[PDB]
Ligand binder design. Structure first.
Ligand SMILES: [K+]
Ligand SMILES: [K+]
Ligand SMILES: [K+]
Ligand SMILES: [Mg+2]
Ligand SMILES: [Mg+2]
Ligand SMILES: [Mg+2]
Ligand SMILES: [Mg+2]
Ligand SMILES: [Mg+2]
Ligand SMILES: [Mg+2]
Ligand SMILES: [Mg+2]
Ligand SMILES: [Mg+2]
Ligand SMILES: [Mg+2]
Ligand SMILES: [Mg+2]
Ligand SMILES: [Mg+2]
Ligand SMILES: [Mg+2]
Ligand SMILES: [Mg+2]
Ligand SMILES: [Mg+2]
Ligand SMILES: [Mg+2]
Ligand SMILES: [Mg+2]
Ligand SMILES: [Mg+2]
Ligand SMILES: [Mg+2]
Ligand SMILES: [Mg+2]
Ligand SMILES: [Mg+2]
Lengths: 88, 49, 101, 565, 132, 171, 312, 196
RNA sequence: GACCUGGCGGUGCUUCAUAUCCCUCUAGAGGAGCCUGUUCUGUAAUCGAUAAACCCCGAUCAACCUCACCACCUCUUGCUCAGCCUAUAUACCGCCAUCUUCAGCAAACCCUGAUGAAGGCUACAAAGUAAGCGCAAGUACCCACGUAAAGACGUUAGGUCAAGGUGUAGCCCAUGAGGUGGCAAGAAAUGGGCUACAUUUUCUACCCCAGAAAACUACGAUAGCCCUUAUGAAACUUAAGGGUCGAAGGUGGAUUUAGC
RNA sequence: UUUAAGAACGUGUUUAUUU
């Protein structure tokens, strides 16, 4: 599609927690679990509203099972009219 | 809402669309206790009075 | 068709606490301040204490939604340690595995 | 993407055990899946409370229970309107009397909405999940009762009543009701005039010359009341004229030319009613040929939109014309028009789809080269339609014409995969072709490996009602294909089945049995050939026996042979 | 001794499947997960509701396809969709499978307010990994 | 609730108590043993108490060339199906209770003199259909082990013969 | 059991499936090696299972199915080998050949190489072997070498020897770089516990060290920490000859010094002789210290300590 | 007799076919459709991995058969008609901040489930350097005292983060409004300012 | 009477134990105060664990709720096509403890013992071949190390019917359901832990080049008492902080825990 | 050849095509 893209791998996060092994007593004996969350950031640059609307829809639909996404959009704006000159 | 889950699957079993292996189990036991005489008594007219 | 009566009593408590949540909120605001007169704050102390007991949120208990167990419950899944492990040990909880390090 | 030739329609489960093999399964598999959707909707609308909880965001209205019961239990003008939107014929009419009996003023826009509900369904309840011949309209019905109760009647009152009569084959009564309309200084609409054209012809079975004059009167009245015709108005004319195949031919074109005059684009249904009319069971078909060629040039390179309910029936008919004309260059235009844009959606239901691809493919095998006929057989089947026993036959008669009999062992495999494993006519034409002439060893050994599979089908048959029967030609061909191949051992075991089922063996099967015995030099086997034919009293046997006696025969056996006759 | 999700050894006449033959300490080494969603990821939400839906689905399908399931289900979530993938036997007639596919896909769509699709893979007999 | 319901294999495994501490060292009387019963044996898919007829599942899809519609059996006709299901149940059950009169040997509960049939056929096309096997002694012998303790083992003595001078015994 | 006909049908499915997989990915079926198959199977069927023997695999049937011995007797029933009834015709036919070559010698008269291991000898013979059987065969081979073996014998003995890749415990020198001014220096990295340090050692200097932009004696008040910084340079007699500029992050007081000590030593290896670098290695100045904090266990007070035990 | 299953359609497939037509969209692994002798599973002693037929491990995988390179290149060729060209003028980032001095950040979250809502989507961040604004000595000195820790002197950037209102369009308006009242009050001079 | 197998021996010889048996190292427990559990006693007033393998154990947790206890009162087809935390863990599933800081269990065959219970090895080899499970191998964490995890068959009718389910037995105007209020204390003994008895210390600054303190105003309570705040509808009661107070205690008996 | 070193309630643990 003619888009600039850079890829880097942020550090993973591992959340652990422990639970009792038995239904009754036997405190000393426990079981530990973990959920591993792995990341992958795709930094695009110099897009337009329409190009991003297409690329995002294309990859969001083909987002596999067990994979979430956080899309941060950095828009370019111009100074409002009221900001150009002071009224006082 | 356990009412919905339990009422839905109770209706689906009477309709013939869901087979509850657990009710069938306790329905067979409750049928063998009638032949053995261990039947639930009538309310109010119980052993005590 | 809930697990037990202990569960059923908590369902009612969570329902009555959802109806009076706003009424209790508005009255407590009067009590939690040093601005309004003491005479007015004393009347709000009696109005919120005359509301039904089950409307108080501290009387709610986070039980397991499958077994009605009051203790040993994980808040993220709303399950007891015994039911959570039964599903995790059979590979039915996405991403959950045993830890080794 | 494009259609996957190796697959069946998406709607089916992509699994070998669940894939529809035959065309009956294809239709019975979707009717069972549609029956489960109805069993679930029945349960969803009978116990709404279980499915009321909505957790979706954004809200999905199409996934919530429907409420078919009236909620306003009071008797008022707004309580009847709610029973007309739910199409409650019995409740609305029984409640309309109560509202009328009370004396409350009923608006004319509300009483007109009740007639539409009654004039359409004919004072009968719509079809629900769970609770042809003759004239549906009845004299003892509420439609006519309420019509008299009304104190005031506008144009719409009669317009909706005339259309309800024609719909239920009350043509004779509709015309009588139209006379009253003209007596009240009123004017009908386009739709009412459209139904009036159907009643004219259907009322009486008169000659065309009289009907044509009758129809022209309604048209002159349509222009005399400032009423403009629509596409449907012209379609009814053509649909009605179908009965008079020969005479209506020229009048039909005049109707078509008229449609073009008023700038009304003929839809697919318009052209459908024309080809059916011109088409007639005749041998020459000179006129039919010229018509279709002109229509295609007009339709070529166009995209169609739904205008008439019968637009779908165009393609099925056009193909039938090409098949009757045996013109393949025209079928490529009819089918090439079905692929442009989204015109593939007009092909119609399954039964119409199977018929289209049968006449089409049956005309391909007959006319075009075999190398191209096999590319159409890989694309259409099974992705498009499931073939019928006849199509397999016509395809077999094309391989013969092209001397490509090496594919026969493959056409039999596909036949079993399409449900033709136990088709008598099919198995009786595959064997004859393989055994018609001698072929090289490599090709002669393949036909036997296929003749052994055709033989097993005769042994195991699904229908056990009647005793297993082996056609005479079959047994004649299964045995001769073992000899030529080299399976002599199995060739002698079929001999008992000939007399067992009283099936006559051909002389060519007996004449070739000689070499098999001669190569073996086992006089015993040679006598068995003689013994069999003697039972049937075949003349060739007696003359044959002498030659066998000259070539190879034991002295003791020679004497016994003559006495057995 | 440990007991969770372990099939005890026997004389050698007991057949087991791949998933049924591996214990919990293989769930990310030699097995995968039978359900795949985003609830249990860092910063995600609604992991408790996704679990109750899973528990109900495995029971709805066990009693709706009685004696037909060859192995455990595989639930998949891609956005709004919910894909149920099952391995079933070939005893039942295909006519009855198509009925239950349309009955379950529809009933579950109105219950959970999501498009639901069911994918069957028939096997002649229950696959056997080894004999314990 | 619906979430506190297990499967049949879990319900029977616990009720039978086949694997327990009582079963290991003769701590349980065999006079009243609990017997497993399959409750899905005589159940049809689509049959319920209300008597609904689902086309494609409970009844044929098409009838007289036309697809059927949803129908429900009548009270009188549905009651005849419940009573008929019982007869099939009791009959099936009765067969199991019925005990065959096995030919006793030297005594009713003894094993001696009882026949075991012909030996099993050998792999290399060997058969012993002409031979007859008969038990002579069945003894229960024990040996003490360090972990379990008393380890019960069976000692059997049999004889085989063809009736024509060929005979032999083994343990 | 897997017959020869079965394997022959698996060879045909792999060849056909190898042409499909190349049509999917858009490659040339001809020049499609096994390395490209493994890369395409990991994209189409992504599995993150820690065990690589449990991931999807599409290999050649000759590498998946275990090698099996051919049939040893024909239709008549006579075996093909004269040592068949031993049960180890392959192992004993080898011992018979070797012992026959030791008789001929009597009549007419290692660094990289390692003796074949047991598990690798079973594959060659397609026979199951005991440990004591492996030792007996190895004793004959060694006895064969001692004797004046002929050329043909050496080739035989080399079928049961496997080369060894001898690693080199020689430190890797860093490339000397040049700055804008033209001064030569070398950069390295160290790691101690959670501390991580990057050190820049200039070829010529007046013995100045700056840690995070601060002179070393101010950054490390404790004498012990400064002793560590002195150890690399004192060992090679280069005190007051180089200028160091390092940046350490993380860890604690003493872990940052050890991390810097290691980086300075690694970067100081470019301005010294090879013999000195070896001495630094034998003194423990170039080795990363693997001793890191051990984890606490459940049911215990610490990594190794236990709760107080009560007998009664 | 019993109904028998048809042979898998992988045999009818050709090698030089169009795979995207077979797996156009995301779908589970169908061994009767994928013409690969792929195996999966941990092998037993002297055994081989389990075959694809009946394998549950291959059904657990989120495959990428519908996203082969051939399809991707063919999909994007049809998606170039929806795209727009980026201004050639705005080559670097220094030139982007000269004509567009304001940067709006907003995050969208994609998660499985029936509800798409997320409260983290309402947040809006607005960054702008004070060198791009028409400020004088006094205004700039006063503006830095009102925003407090929202201004970074090291970068000379004013950061405004709004998460008060439910919707994201409202917080965008709120942020612009905040930048406006700050700019004008900064210019305004009051009497108390004299007592500095 | 004579044997088989196992167990046991204050039974022999030999080789060993690696934080483990002795000797040998380091810090603790047992003494004081406090926190906390348990046992007894007490109360109208839960239950369960309770040699090793119970004792900050079910509880990653009790002011009401939780809660199953006591008193009083109230309801009867009852949130449930009812219900019961009623009895039975010596009927069970399920999840575990323990030997295990082990390496053996064993189907199917063969042979020996005159065809007995049983047994089955010697490598310069004498009847053993062995699927499978476990160990091992692999995998996780920072490796090849180490730590985790794993750890069969069985042993203690070991623990749990009060996670849930459940066989058998029992209650059905009550052994069920709901409401209000209330008990959860200490003569006494004991387990574990916290803080101290000080100068390698105490306070302040700093976060390692300092100044003061240092025995009846020292060191030393997280205790008591009083006040305030936080949470909550509700706090002498729970927590935090402040004030006041300045106790025992001067390194601890027989004995005893952990650590490469 | 080499200090002393007691005691442990009673039962219960194995078969059968539109038209
Ligand atoms: K002490
Ligand atoms: K103490
Ligand atoms: K203590
Ligand atoms: Mg609480
Ligand atoms: Mg353990
Ligand atoms: Mg008797
Ligand atoms: Mg410590
Ligand atoms: Mg207690
Ligand atoms: Mg007790
Ligand atoms: Mg107990
Ligand atoms: Mg309480
Ligand atoms: Mg209370
Ligand atoms: Mg009770
Ligand atoms: Mg027990
Ligand atoms: Mg461990
Ligand atoms: Mg291991
Ligand atoms: Mg006990
Ligand atoms: Mg403790
Ligand atoms: Mg104090
Ligand atoms: Mg307060
Ligand atoms: Mg003091
Ligand atoms: Mg005594
Ligand atoms: Mg005793």
């Amino acid at each position: 599609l003619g888009i600039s893209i850079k890829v880097h791998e942020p550090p993973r996060k591992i959340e652990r927690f422990t639970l009792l092994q038995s239904v009754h007593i036997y405190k000393k004996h426990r079981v530990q679990y973990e959920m591993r969350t792995l990341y992958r950031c795709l930094e695009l640059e110099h897009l337009t509203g329409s190009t991003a609307d297409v690329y995002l829809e294309y990859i969001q639909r083909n987002l596999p099972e067990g994979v979430a996404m956080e899309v941060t959009k950095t828009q370019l704006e111009q100074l409002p009219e009221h900001i150009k000159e002071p009224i006082w | 809402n356990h009412h919905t889950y339990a009422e839905l699957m109770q209706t689906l079993r009477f309709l013939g669309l869901y087979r509850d292996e657990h009710q069938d189990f306790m329905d067979e036991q409750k049928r063998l206790k009638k032949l053995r005489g261990k039947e639930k008594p009538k309310k109010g007219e119980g052993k005590r009075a | 068709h809930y697990v037990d009566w202990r569960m059923w009593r908590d369902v009612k408590r969570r329902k009555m606490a959802y109806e009076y949540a706003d009424e209790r909120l508005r009255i407590n605001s009067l009590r939690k301040n040093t601005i309004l007169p003491k005479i007015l704050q004393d009347v709000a102390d009696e109005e919120i204490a005359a509301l039904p007991r089950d409307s108080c949120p501290v009387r709610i208990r986070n039980r397991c939604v499958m077994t009605s167990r009051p203790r040993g419950v994980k808040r993220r899944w709303r399950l007891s340690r015994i039911v959570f492990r039964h599903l995790a040990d059979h590979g039915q909880l996405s991403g959950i595995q045993r830890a080794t390090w | 993407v494009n259609r996957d030739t190796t697959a069946v329609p998406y709607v089916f489960q992509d699994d070998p055990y669940l894939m529809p093999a035959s065309s009956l399964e294809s239709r019975s598999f979707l009717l069972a899946k549609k029956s489960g959707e109805n069993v679930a909707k029945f349960i969803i609308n009978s116990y709404p409370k279980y499915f009321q909880k909505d957790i979706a965001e954004p809200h999905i209205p199409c996934l919530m229970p429907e409420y078919f019961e009236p909620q306003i239990k009071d008797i008022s003008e707004a309580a009847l309107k709610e029973r007309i939107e739910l199409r409650k014929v019995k409740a609305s009419v029984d409640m309309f009397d109560q509202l009328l009996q009370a004396g409350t003023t009923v608006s004319l826009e509300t009483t007109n909405s009740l007639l539409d509900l009654l004039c359409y369904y004919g004072d009968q309840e719509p079809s629900t999940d769970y609770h042809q011949f003759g004239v549906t309209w009845r004299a003892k019905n509420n439609a006519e009762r309420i019509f008299s109760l009304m104190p005031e009647k506008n144009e719409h009152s009669y317009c909706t009543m005339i259309r309800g009569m024609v719909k239920h084959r009350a043509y004779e009564q509709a015309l009588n009701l139209y006379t009253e309309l003209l007596n009240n200084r009123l004017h009908a609409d386009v739709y009412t005039f459209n139904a009036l054209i159907e009643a004219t012809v259907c009322a009486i079975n008169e000659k065309f010359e009289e009907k044509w004059s009758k129809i022209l009167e309604l048209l002159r009245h349509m222009v005399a009341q400032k009423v403009k015709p629509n596409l449907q108005t012209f379609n009814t004319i053509l649909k009605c004229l179908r009965r008079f195949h020969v005479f209506a031919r020229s009048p039909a074109l005049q109707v078509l030319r008229e449609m073009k005059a008023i700038g009304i684009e003929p839809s697919l249904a318009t052209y459908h009613h024309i080809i059916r009319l011109f088409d007639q069971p005749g041998d020459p078909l000179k006129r039919s040929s010229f018509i279709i060629y002109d229509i295609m040039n007009e339709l070529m390179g166009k995209r169609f939109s739904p205008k008439d309910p019968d637009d779908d029936k165009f393609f099925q008919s056009a193909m039938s014309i090409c098949s009757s004309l045996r013109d393949l260059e025209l079928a490529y235009q009819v089918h090439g028009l079905l692929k442009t844009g989204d015109n593939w959606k007009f092909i119609g239901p399954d039964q119409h789809r199977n018929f289209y691809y049968s006449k089409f493919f049956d005309l391909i095998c007959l006319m075009e080269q075999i190398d191209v006929t096999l590319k159409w057989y890989e694309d259409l089947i099974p992705s498009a339609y499931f073939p019928h026993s006849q199509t397999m036959i016509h395809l077999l008669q094309a391989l013969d014409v092209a001397n490509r009999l090496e594919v026969i062992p493959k056409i039999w495999k596909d036949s079993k995969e399409y449900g033709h494993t136990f088709r008598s006519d099919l198995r009786e034409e595959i064997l004859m072709l393989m055994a018609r002439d001698k072929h090289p060893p490599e090709l002669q050994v393949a036909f036997a490996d296929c003749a052994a599979d055709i033989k097993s089908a005769y042994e195991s048959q699904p229908i056990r009602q009647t005793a297993q029967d082996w056609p005479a030609t079959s047994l004649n061909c299964i045995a001769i294909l073992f000899l030529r191949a080299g399976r002599t051992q199995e060739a002698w075991k079929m001999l008992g089945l000939f007399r067992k089922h009283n099936k006559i063996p051909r002389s060519e099967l007996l004449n070739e049995l000689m070499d098999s015995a001669k190569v073996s030099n086992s006089p015993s086997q040679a006598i068995e050939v003689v013994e069999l034919a003697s039972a049937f009293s075949l003349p060739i046997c007696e003359g044959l026996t002498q030659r066998v006696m000259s070539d190879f025969a034991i002295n003791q056996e020679q004497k016994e042979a003559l006495s057995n006759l | 001794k440990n007991r969770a999700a372990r099939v005890r050894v026997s004389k050698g006449d007991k057949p087991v499947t791949y998933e049924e033959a591996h214990a919990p300490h293989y769930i990310a080494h030699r097995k995968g997960w039978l359900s795949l969603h985003t609830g249990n990821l860092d910063g995600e939400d609604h992991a408790a509701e996704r679990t109750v839906e899973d528990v109900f689905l495995r029971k709805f399908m066990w009693g709706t396809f009685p004696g037909c399931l060859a192995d455990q289900l595989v639930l998949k979530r891609r956005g709004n969709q919910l894909e149920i993938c099952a391995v079933v036997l070939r005893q039942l007639s295909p006519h009855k499978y198509y009925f239950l596919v349309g009955y379950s896909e529809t009933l579950l769509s109105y219950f959970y307010k999501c498009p639901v699709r069911l994918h069957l893979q028939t096997v002649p007999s229950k696959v056997v990994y080894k004999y314990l | 609730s619906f979430f506190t319901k297990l499967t049949a294999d879990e319900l029977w495994k616990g009720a039978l108590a086949e694997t327990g501490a009582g079963a290991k060292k003769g701590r349980g009387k065999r006079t009243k043993k609990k017997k497993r019963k399959d409750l899905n044996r005589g159940q049809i898919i689509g049959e319920g108490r209300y008597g609904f007829l689902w086309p494609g599942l409970n009844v044929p899809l098409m009838k007289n060339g036309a697809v059927q519609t949803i129908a429900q059996r009548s009270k009188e006709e549905q009651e005849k199906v419940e009573a008929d299901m019982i007869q099939q149940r009791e009959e099936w059950d009765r067969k199991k209770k019925m005990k065959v009169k096995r030919e006793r040997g030297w005594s009713g509960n003894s094993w001696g003199g009882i026949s075991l049939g012909p030996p099993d056929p050998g792999p290399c096309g060997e058969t012993y259909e002409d031979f007859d096997t008969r038990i002579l002694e069945v003894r229960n012998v024990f040996t003490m082990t360090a972990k379990e303790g008393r380890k019960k083992s069976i000692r059997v003595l049999v004889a085989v013969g063809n009736g024509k001078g060929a005979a032999g015994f083994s343990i | 059991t897997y017959t020869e006909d079965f394997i022959k049908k698996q060879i045909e499915e792999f060849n056909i499936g190898k042409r499909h997989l190349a049509n999917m990915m858009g490659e040339d079926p001809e020049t499609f090696t096994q390395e490209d198959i493994d890369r395409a199977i990991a994209y189409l069927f992504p599995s993150g299972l820690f065990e690589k023997r449990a991931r999807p695999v599409m290999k050649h049937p000759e590498q998946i199915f275990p090698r099996q011995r051919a049939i040893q007797w024909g239709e008549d029933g006579r075996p093909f080998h004269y040592l068949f009834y031993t049960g180890k015709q392959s192992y004993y036919s080898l011992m018979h050949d070797v012992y026959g070559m030791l008789l001929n010698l009597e009549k007419h008269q290692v660094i990289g190489s390692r003796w074949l291991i047991k598990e690798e000898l079973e594959e060659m013979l397609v026979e199951k072997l005991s440990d004591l059987d492996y030792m007996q065969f190895i004793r004959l081979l060694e006895k064969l070498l001692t004797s004046q073996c002929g050329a043909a014998e050496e080739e035989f003995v080399q079928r049961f020897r496997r080369s060894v890749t001898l690693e080199s415990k020689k430190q890797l020198i860093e490339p000397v770089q040049y700055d804008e001014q033209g001064m030569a220096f070398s950069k390295s990295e160290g790691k101690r516990k959670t501390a991580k340090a990057e050190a820049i050692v200039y070829k010529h200097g007046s013995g100045r060290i700056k840690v995070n932009g601060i002179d070393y004696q101010l950054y490390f008040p404790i004498t012990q920490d400064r002793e560590q910084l002195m150890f690399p340079f004192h060992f090679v007699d280069r005190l007051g000859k180089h200028d160091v500029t390092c940046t350490v992050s993380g860890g604690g007081r003493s872990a940052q010094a050890g991390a810097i000590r290691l980086a300075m030593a690694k970067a100081l290896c470019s301005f010294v002789t090879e013999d000195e670098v070896e001495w630094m290695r034998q003194a423990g100045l170039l080795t990363t210290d693997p001793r890191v904090r051990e984890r606490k266990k459940p049911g215990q007070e610490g990594a190794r300590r236990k709760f107080t035990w009560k007998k009664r | 007799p019993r109904r028998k299953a048809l042979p898998p359609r992988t045999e009818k497939m050709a090698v030089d076919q169009d795979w995207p037509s077979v797996y156009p969209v995301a779908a589970p692994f169908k061994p009767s459709a994928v013409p690969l002798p792929v195996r999966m599973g941990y092998p037993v002693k002297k055994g081989v991995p389990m075959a694809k037929e009946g394998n549950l491990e291959l059904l657990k995988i989120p495959n990428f058969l519908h996203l082969t390179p051939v399809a991707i290149k063919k999909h994007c060729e049809a998606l170039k008609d929806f795209c727009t060209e980026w201004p050639a003028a705005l080559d670097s980032d220094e030139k982007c901040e000269k004509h567009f001095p304001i940067e709006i950040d907003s995050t969208d979250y994609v998660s499985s489930g029936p509800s798409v809502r997320n409260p983290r989507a309402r947040v809006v961040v607005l960054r702008v350097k004070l060198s791009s604004l028409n400020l004088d000595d006094h205004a700039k000195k006063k503006l830095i005292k009102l925003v407090g820790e929202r201004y970074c002197k090291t970068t000379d950037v004013l950061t405004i983060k709004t998460d008060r209102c439910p919707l994201r369009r409202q917080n965008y308006d709120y942020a612009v409004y905040l930048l406006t009242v700050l700019y004008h009050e900064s210019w305004n001079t009051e009497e108390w300012e004299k007592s500095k």
